Coordinates of C-alpha atoms and ligand atoms in Angstrom, one line a residue:
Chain A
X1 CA 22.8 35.6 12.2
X2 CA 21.1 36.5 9.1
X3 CA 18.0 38.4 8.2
X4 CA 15.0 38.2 5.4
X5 CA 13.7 41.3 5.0
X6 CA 10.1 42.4 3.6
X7 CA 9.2 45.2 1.3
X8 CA 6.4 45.6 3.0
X9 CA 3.0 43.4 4.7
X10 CA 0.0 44.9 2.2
X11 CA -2.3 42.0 3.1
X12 CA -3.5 40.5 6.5
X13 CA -1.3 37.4 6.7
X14 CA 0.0 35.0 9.4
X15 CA 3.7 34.7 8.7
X16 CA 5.4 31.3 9.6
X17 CA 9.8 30.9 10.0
X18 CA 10.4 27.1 10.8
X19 CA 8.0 25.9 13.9
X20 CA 7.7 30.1 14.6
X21 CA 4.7 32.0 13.6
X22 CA 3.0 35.5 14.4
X23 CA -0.3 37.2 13.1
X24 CA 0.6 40.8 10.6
X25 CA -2.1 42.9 9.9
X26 CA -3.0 44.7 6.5
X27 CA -0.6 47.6 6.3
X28 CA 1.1 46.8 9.8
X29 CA 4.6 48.5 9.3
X30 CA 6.5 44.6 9.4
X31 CA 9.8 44.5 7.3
X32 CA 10.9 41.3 8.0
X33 CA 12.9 38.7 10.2
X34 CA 16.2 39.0 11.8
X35 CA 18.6 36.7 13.8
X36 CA 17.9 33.7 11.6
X37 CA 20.5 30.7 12.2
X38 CA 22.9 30.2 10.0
X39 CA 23.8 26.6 9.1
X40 CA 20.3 25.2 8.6
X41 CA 17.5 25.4 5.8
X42 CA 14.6 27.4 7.2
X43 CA 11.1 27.6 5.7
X44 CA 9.0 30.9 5.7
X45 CA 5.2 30.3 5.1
X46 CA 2.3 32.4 5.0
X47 CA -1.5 32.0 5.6
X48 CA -3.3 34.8 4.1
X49 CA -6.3 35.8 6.8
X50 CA -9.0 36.1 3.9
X51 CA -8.6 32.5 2.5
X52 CA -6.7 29.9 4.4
X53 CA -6.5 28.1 1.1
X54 CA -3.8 30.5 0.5
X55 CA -1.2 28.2 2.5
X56 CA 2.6 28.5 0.7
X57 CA 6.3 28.9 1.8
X58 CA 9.6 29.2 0.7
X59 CA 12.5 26.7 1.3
X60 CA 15.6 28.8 1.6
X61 CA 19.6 28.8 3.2
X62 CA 20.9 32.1 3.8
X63 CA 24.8 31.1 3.1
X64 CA 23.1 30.5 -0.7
X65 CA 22.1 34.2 -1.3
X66 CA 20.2 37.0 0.5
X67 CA 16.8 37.2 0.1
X68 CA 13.7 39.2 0.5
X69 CA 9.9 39.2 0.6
X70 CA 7.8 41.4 -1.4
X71 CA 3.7 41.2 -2.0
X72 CA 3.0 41.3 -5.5
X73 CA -0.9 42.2 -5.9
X74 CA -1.1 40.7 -9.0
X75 CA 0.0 37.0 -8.2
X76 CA -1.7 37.5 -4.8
X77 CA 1.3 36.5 -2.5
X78 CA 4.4 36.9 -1.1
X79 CA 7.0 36.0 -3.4
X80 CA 10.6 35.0 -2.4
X81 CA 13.6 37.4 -4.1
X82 CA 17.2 37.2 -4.6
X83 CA 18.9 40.8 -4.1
X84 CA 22.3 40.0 -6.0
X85 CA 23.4 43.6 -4.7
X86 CA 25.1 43.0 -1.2
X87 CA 25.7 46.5 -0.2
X88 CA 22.0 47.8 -1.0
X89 CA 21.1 44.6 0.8
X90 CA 23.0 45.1 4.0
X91 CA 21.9 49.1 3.9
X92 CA 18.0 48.0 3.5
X93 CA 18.6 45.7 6.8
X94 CA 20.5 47.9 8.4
X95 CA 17.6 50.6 8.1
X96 CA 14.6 48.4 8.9
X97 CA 16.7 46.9 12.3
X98 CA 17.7 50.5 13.5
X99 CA 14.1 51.4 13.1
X100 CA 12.9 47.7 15.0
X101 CA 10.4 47.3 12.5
X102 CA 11.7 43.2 12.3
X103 CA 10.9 40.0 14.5
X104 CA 13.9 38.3 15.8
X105 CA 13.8 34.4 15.0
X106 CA 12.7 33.6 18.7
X107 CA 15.6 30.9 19.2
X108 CA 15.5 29.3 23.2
X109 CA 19.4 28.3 23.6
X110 CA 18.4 25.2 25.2
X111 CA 15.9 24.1 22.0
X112 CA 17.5 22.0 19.4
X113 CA 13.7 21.5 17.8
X114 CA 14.6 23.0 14.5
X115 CA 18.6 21.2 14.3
X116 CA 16.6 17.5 15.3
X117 CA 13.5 18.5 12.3
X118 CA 16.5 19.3 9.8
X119 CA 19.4 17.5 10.8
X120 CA 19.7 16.1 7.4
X121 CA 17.8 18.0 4.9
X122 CA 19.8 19.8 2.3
X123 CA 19.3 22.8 0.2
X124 CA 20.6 21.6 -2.7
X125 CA 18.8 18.2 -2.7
X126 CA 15.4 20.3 -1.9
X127 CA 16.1 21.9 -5.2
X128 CA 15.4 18.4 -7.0
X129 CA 12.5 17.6 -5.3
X130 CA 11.3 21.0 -6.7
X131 CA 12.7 21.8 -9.7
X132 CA 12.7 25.6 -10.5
X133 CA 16.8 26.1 -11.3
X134 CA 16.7 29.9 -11.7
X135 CA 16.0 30.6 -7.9
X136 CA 17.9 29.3 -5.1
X137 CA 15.0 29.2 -2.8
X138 CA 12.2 26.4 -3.5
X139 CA 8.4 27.6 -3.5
X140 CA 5.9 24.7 -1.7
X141 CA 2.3 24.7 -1.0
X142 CA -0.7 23.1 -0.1
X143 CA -1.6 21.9 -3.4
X144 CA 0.8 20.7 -5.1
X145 CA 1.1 17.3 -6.3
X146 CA 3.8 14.4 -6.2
X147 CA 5.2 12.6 -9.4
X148 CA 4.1 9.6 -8.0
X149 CA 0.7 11.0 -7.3
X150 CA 0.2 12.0 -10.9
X151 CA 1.2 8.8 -12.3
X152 CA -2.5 7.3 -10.9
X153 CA -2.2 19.0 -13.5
X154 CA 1.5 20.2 -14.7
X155 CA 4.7 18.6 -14.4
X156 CA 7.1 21.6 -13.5
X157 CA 4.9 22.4 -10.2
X158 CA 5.2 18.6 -8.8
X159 CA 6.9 17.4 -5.4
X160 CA 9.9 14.8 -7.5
X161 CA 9.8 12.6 -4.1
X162 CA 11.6 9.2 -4.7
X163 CA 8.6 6.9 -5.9
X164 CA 8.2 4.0 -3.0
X165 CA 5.8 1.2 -4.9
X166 CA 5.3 -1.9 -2.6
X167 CA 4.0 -3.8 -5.5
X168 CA 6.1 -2.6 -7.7
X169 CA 9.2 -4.3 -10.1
X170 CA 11.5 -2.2 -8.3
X171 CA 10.3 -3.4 -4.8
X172 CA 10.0 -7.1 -5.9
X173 CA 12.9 -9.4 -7.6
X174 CA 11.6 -12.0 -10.2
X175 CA 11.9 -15.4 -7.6
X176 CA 12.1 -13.3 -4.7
X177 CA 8.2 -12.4 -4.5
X178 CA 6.9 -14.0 -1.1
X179 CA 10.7 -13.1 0.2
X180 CA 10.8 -9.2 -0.9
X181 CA 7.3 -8.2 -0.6
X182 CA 7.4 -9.5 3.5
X183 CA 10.9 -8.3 3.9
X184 CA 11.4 -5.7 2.2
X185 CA 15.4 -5.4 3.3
X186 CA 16.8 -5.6 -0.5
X187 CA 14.0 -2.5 -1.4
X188 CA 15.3 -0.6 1.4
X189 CA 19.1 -1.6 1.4
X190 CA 20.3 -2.5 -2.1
X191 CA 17.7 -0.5 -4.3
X192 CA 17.0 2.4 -2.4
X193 CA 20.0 3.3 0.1
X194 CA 22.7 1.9 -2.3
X195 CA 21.2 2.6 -6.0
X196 CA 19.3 5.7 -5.4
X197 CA 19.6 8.0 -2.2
X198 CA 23.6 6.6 -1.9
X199 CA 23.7 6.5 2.1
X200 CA 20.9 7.0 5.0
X201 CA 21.5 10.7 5.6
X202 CA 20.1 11.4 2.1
X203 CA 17.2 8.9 2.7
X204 CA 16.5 10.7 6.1
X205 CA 16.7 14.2 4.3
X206 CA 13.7 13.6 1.8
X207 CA 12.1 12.1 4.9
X208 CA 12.4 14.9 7.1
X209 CA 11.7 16.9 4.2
X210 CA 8.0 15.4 3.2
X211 CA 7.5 15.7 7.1
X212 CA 7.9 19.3 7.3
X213 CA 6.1 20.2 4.4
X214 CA 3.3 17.8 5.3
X215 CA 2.9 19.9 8.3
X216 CA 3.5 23.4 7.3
X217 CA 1.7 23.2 3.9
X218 CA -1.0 20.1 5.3
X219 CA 0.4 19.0 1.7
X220 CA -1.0 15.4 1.7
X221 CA 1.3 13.9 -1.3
X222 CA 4.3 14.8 1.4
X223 CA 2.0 13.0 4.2
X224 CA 2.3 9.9 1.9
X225 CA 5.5 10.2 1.2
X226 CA 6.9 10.4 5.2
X227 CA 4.6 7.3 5.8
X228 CA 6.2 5.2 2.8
X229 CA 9.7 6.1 3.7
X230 CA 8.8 5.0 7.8
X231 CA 6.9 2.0 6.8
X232 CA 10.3 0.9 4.1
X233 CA 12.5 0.7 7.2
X234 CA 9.8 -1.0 9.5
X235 CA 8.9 -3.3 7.2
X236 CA 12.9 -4.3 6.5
X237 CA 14.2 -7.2 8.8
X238 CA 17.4 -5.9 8.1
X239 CA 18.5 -2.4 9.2
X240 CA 21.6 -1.0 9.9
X241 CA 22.1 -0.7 14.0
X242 CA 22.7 3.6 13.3
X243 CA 19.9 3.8 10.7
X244 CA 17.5 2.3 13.4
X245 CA 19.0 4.5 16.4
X246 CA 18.3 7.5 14.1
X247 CA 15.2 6.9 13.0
X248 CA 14.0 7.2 16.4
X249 CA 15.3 10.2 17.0
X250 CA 14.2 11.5 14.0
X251 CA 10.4 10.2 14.8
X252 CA 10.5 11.9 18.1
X253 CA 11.0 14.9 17.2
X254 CA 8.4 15.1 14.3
X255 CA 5.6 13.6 16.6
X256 CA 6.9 15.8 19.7
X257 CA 6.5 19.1 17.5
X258 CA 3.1 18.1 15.3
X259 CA 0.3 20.4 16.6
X260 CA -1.7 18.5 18.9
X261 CA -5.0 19.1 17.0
X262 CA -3.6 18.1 13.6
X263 CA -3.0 14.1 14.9
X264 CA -6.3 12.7 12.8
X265 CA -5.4 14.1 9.4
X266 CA -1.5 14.0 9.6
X267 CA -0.8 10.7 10.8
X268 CA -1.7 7.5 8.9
X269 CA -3.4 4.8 11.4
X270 CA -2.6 1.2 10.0
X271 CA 1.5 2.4 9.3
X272 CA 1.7 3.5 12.7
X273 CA 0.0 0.6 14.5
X274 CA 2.3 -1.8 11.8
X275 CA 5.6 0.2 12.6
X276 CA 5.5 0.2 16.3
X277 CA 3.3 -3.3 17.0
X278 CA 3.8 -5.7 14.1
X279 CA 7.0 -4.9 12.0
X280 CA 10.6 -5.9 12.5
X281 CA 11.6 -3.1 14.1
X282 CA 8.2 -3.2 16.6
X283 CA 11.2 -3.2 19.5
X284 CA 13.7 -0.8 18.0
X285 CA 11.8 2.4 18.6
X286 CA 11.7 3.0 21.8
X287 CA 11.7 6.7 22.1
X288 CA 8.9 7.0 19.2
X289 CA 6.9 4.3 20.6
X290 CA 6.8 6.1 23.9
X291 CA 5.8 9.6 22.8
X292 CA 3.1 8.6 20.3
X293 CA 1.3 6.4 23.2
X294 CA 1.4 9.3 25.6
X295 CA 0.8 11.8 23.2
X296 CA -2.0 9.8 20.9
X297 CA -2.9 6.8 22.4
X298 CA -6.3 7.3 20.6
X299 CA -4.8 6.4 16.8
X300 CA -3.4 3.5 18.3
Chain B
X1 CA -13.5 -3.9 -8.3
X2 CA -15.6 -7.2 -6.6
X3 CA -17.0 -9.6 -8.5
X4 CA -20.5 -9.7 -6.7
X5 CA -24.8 -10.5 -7.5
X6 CA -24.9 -7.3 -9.5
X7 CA -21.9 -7.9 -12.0
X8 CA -22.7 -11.7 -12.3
X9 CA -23.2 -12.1 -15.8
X10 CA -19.4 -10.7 -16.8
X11 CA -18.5 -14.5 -16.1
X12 CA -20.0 -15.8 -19.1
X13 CA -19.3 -13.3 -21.9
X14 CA -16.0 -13.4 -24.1
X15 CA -13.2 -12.1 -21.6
X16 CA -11.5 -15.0 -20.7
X17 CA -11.2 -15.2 -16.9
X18 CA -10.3 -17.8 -14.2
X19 CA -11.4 -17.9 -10.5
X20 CA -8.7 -19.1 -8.2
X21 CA -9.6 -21.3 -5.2
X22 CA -6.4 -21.7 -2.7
X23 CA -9.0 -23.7 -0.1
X24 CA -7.4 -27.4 -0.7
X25 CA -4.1 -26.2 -1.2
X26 CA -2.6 -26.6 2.4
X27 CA -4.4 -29.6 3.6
X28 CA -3.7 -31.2 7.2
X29 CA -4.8 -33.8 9.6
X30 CA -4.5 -32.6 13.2
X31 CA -3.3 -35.8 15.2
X32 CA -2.4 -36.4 19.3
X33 CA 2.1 -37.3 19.0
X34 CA 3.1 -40.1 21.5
X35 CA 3.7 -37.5 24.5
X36 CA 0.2 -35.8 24.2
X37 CA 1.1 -33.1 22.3
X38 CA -0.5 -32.1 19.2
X39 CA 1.1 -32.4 15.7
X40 CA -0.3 -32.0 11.9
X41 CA 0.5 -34.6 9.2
X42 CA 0.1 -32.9 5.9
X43 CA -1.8 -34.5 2.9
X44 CA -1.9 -33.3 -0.9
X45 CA -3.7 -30.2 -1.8
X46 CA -4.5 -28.9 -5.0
X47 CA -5.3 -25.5 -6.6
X48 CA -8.3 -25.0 -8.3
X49 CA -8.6 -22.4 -11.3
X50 CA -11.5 -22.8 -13.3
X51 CA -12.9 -20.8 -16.6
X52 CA -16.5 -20.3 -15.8
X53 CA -17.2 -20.2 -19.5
X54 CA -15.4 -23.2 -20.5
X55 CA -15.2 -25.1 -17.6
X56 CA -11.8 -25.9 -18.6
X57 CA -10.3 -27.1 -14.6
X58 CA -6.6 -26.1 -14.3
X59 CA -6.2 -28.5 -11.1
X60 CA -2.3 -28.1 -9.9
X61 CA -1.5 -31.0 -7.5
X62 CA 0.1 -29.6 -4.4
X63 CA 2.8 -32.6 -2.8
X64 CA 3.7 -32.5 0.6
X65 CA 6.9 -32.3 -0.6
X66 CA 6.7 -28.2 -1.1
X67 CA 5.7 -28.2 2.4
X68 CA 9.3 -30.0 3.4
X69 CA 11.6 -27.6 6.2
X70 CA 9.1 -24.5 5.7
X71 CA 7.4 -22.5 8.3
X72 CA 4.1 -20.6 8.5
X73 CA 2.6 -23.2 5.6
X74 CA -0.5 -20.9 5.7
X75 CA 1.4 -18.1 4.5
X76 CA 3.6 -20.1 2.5
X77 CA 0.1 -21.1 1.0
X78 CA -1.1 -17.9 -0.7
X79 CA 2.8 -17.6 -2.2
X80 CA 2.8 -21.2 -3.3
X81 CA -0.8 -20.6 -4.6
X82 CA 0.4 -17.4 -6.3
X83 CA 3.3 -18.6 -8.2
X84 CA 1.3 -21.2 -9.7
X85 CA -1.2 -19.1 -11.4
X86 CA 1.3 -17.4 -12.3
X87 CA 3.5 -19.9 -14.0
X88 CA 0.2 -21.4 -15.7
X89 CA -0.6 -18.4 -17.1
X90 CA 3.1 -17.8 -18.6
X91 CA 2.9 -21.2 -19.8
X92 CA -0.9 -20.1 -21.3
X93 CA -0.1 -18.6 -25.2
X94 CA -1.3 -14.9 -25.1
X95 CA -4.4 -15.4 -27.0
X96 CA -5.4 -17.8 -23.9
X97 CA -3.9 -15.5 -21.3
X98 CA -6.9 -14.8 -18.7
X99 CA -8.0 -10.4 -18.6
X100 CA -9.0 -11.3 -14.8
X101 CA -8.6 -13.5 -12.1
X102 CA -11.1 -13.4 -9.6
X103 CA -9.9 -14.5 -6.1
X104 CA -12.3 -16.7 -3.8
X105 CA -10.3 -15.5 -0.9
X106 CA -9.3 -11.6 -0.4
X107 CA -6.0 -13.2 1.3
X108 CA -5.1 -13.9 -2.3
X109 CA -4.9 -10.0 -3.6
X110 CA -1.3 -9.4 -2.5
X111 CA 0.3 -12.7 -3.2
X112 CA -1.2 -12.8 -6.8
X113 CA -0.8 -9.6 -7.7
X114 CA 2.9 -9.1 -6.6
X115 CA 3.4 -12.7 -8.5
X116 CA 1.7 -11.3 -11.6
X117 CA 3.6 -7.7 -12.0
X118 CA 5.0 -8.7 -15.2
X119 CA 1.1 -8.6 -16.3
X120 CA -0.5 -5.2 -15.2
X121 CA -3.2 -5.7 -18.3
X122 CA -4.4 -8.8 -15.5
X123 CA -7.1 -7.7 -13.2
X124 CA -7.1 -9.4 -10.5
X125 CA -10.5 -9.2 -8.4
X126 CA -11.9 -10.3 -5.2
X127 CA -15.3 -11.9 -4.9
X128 CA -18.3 -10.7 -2.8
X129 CA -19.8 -14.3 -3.0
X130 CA -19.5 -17.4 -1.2
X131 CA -18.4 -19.9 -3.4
X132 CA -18.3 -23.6 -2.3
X133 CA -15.0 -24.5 -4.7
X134 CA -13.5 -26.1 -1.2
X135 CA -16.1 -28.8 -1.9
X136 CA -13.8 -30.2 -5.0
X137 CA -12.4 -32.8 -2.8
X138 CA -16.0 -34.5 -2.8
X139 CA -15.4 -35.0 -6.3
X140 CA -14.5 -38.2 -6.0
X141 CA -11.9 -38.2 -9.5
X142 CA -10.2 -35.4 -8.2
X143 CA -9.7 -36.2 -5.2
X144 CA -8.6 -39.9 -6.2
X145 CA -5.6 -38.0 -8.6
X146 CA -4.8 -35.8 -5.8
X147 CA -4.2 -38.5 -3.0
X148 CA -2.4 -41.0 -5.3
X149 CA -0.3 -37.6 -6.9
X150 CA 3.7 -38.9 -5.6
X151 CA 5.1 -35.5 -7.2
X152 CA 3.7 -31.9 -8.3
X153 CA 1.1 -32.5 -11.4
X154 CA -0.9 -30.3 -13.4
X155 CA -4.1 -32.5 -14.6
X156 CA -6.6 -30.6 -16.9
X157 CA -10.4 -31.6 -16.9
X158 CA -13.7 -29.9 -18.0
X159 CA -15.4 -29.9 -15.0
X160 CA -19.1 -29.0 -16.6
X161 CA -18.4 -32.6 -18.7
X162 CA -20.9 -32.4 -22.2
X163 CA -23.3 -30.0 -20.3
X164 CA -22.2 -27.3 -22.5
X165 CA -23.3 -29.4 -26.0
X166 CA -26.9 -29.2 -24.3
X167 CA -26.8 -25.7 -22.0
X168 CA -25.2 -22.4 -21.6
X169 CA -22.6 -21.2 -19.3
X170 CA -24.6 -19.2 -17.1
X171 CA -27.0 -22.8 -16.4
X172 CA -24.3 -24.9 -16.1
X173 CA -22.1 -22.7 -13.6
X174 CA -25.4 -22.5 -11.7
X175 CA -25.6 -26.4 -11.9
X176 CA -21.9 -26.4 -10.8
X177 CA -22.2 -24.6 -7.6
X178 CA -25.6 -26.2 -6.9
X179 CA -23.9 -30.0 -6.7
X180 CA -21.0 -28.4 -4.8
X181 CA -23.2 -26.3 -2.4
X182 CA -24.8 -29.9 -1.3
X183 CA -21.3 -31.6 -1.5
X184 CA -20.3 -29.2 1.1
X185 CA -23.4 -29.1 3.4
X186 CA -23.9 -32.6 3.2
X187 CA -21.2 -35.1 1.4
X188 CA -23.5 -38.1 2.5
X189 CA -26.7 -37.0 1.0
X190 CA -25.0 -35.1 -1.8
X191 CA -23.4 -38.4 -3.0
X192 CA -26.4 -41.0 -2.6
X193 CA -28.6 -38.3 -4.9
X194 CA -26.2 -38.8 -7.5
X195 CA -25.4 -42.4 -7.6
X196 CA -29.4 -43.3 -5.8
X197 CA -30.0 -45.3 -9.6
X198 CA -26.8 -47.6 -10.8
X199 CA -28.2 -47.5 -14.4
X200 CA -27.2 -43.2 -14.8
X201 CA -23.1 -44.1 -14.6
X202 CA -19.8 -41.8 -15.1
X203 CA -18.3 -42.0 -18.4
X204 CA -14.7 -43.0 -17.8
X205 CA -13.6 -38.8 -19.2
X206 CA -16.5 -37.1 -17.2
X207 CA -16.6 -36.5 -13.3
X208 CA -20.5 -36.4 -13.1
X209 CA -23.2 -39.0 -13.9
X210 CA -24.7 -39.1 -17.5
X211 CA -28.5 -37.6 -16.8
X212 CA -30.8 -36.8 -19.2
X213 CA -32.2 -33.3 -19.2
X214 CA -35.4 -34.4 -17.1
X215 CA -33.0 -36.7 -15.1
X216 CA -31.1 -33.3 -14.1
X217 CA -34.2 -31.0 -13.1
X218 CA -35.0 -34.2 -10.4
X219 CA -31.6 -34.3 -9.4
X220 CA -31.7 -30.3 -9.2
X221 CA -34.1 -30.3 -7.3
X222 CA -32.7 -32.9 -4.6
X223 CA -29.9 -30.7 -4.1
X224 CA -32.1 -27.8 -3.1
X225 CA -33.7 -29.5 -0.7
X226 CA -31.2 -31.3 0.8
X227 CA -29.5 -27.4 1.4
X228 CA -32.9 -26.4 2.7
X229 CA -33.3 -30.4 4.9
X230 CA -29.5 -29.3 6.4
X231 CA -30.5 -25.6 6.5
X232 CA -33.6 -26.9 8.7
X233 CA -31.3 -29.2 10.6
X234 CA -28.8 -26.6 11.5
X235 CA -30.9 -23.6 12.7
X236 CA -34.2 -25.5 13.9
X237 CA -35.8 -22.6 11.4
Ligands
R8A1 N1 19.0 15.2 1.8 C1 17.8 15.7 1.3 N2 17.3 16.9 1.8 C2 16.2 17.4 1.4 C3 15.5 16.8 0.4 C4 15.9 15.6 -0.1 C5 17.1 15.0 0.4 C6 17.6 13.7 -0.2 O1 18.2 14.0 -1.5

């Protein structure tokens, strides 16, 4: 198990580690997290009590590196670190544990939330959505914006998200117009899973990716993103059987954990209502379809 | 955005546009089959894309033929529709090429514009009024080409006639939806007002009788209150 350690908790601050979170106070003596999976990314996230604007997090795997917290009071957050020196590393830990002054990732055996959120998300493909090559952890937050959302302000804090365009060349082949833009199987199969993401587990990475930081950041280019990358496959006649199976699975596990409260800005009305009534793949959701109509019947 | 009351007079200034009617494209009769059962027979449709300013008529003669072993011909419509416009306006030198299309149907949006992606500089627009282009067919020389049509044709007319030697635009769409408001409401009456006095006849390369200016204000004014007669008719108001 491994450990992310803080310098210290200056600021009043509720501290976030995957679907885990827990209220520090200003000057609480906190010095970190312990007992941290290994295998899995994990996202650490922070909401500063004097301005919930303040909502940012860190994208990080603990086999790349070990890596700390510290407040810096000029930047106004808590900002990720590399320690590059194991042995000072391990002897910081080993102090802060001794002295209990570090929450322990509160893992139930029988919960495989985190594993079913992340089955497929990858550091190092995180590190080309957000592009920032001399750390090994990827910064997120609230704010920022999707290349695809500034094409309709700066380019090296964007979300590089694969750009989904319905009505786009990409989407529609010269001759194929009525064809493509009602099937969308070629878009999906040929030009996406072939051409760009290579197989399905990529394609499910970036959308369990844009999931999570929808919800942990309420990032609303990410939102759009998760909802594109649903309504491609529900919108394709022509789906591999696992990709479909998966999907499901995947879907279930992102409505099951969504905060109940967060439904009406987090979840897009007309793609839902087309994925699970009028699409191709209306019938081929079965586990999705039965959680979202128990859980938000309302939206539907 | 929507072409509406407000934003009216864009229609006549010097950005060529065409609207784009897909009403008489998909045309049927609904007809009882030996066994009771219900069947349509379908007949030839046209599009209709007209400059406002010109009056220059692109009517494209829809065959039954396109309809032959395809399903969900409403849908197929729209498409159809779609990649016509399309294809006129590739076969259109650039200098001709339309800025906008406005739609008379919002079912058009998505069809058109995924047909026209290789022209983004295009607007295409949807239309807050209520156009009566579906009256057309009441025009009794397009309707003649389109019925006797045995294969797809494109067949160009100037659906204003002359009017334009004597008025502007803005007057002579007015008159133009006027005569096809009263088609629409009432074919009958519509078509006595305009041949009541054999003397005013249709030159053989116009669609509408020859009136005088006065003869028009009369005939005008027929039309009105035939829409208001058939208004009064409908609603008992
Ligand atoms: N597999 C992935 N994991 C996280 C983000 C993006 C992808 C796809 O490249």
């Amino acid at each position: 198990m491994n450990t992310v350690p803080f310098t210290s908790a200056p600021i009043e601050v509720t501290i976030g580690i995957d679907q885990y979170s827990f209220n520090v106070k200003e000057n609480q003596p906190f010095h970190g997290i312990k007992d941290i999976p290994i295998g899995h990314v994990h996202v650490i996230h922070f909401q500063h009590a004097d301005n919930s604007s303040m909502r940012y997090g860190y994208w990080f795997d603990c086999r790349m590196g070990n890596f700390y917290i510290q407040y810096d009071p000029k930047d106004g957050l808590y900002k990720m670190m590399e320690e590059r020196d194991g042995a000072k590393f391990e002897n910081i830990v080993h102090n802060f544990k001794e002295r209990q002054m570090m929450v322990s990732y509160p893992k139930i055996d029988e919960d495989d939330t985190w594993y079913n959120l992340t089955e497929f998300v990858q550091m190092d493909k995180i590190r080309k959505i957000v592009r920032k090559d001399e750390n090994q952890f990827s910064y997120v937050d609230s704010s920022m914006t999707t290349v695809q959302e500034n094409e309709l302000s700066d380019p090296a804090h964007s979300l590089n998200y694969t750009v989904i365009n319905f009505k786009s060349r990409e989407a529609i082949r010269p001759g194929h117009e009525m064809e493509d833009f009602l099937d969308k199987s070629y878009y999906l199969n040929t030009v996406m899973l072939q051409g760009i993401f290579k197989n399905s587990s990529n394609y499910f990475g970036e959308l369990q990716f844009a999931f999570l930081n929808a919800m942990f950041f309420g990032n609303y280019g990410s939102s759009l993103q998760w909802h594109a990358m649903i309504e491609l496959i529900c919108s394709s006649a022509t789906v591999p059987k696992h990709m479909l199976d998966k999907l499901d699975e995947i879907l279930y596990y992102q409505i099951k954990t969504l905060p109940e409260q967060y439904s009406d800005i987090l979840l897009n009305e007309r793609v839902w209502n087309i994925c699970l009534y009028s699409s191709f793949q209306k019938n081929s959701l079965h586990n999705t379809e039965k959680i979202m109509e128990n859980k938000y019947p309302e939206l539907l | 955005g929507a072409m509406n009351s407000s934003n009216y007079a864009e229609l006549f200034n010097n950005d060529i546009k065409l609207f784009v009617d897909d009403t008489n494209v998909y045309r049927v009769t609904v007809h009882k089959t030996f066994e009771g059962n219900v069947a349509t027979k379908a007949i030839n449709g046209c599009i209709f894309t007209l400059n406002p300013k010109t009056g220059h008529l692109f009517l494209k003669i829809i065959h039954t033929s396109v309809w032959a072993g395809q399903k969900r011909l409403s849908q197929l419509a729209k498409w159809k529709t779609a990649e016509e416009v399309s294809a006129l306006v590739r076969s259109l030198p650039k200098e001709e090429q339309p800025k906008q299309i406005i739609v008379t149907r919002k079912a058009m949006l998505d069809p058109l514009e995924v047909h026209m992606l290789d022209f983004p500089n295009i607007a295409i627009r949807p239309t807050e009024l209520r156009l009566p282009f579906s009256a057309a067919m009441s025009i009794d020389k397009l309707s003649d080409v389109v019925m006797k049509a045995t294969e797809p044709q494109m067949v160009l007319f100037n659906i204003y006639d002359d009017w334009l030697d004597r008025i502007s635009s803005y007057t002579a769409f007015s008159r133009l939806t006027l005569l096809l408001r009263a088609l629409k409401t009432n074919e009958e009456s519509a078509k006595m007002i305009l041949l009541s006095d054999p003397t005013i006849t249709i030159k053989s390369y116009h669609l509408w009788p020859s009136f005088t200016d006065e003869q028009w204000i009369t005939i005008e004014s027929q039309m009105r209150d035939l829409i208001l007669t058939e208004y009064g008719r409908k609603y008992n108001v």
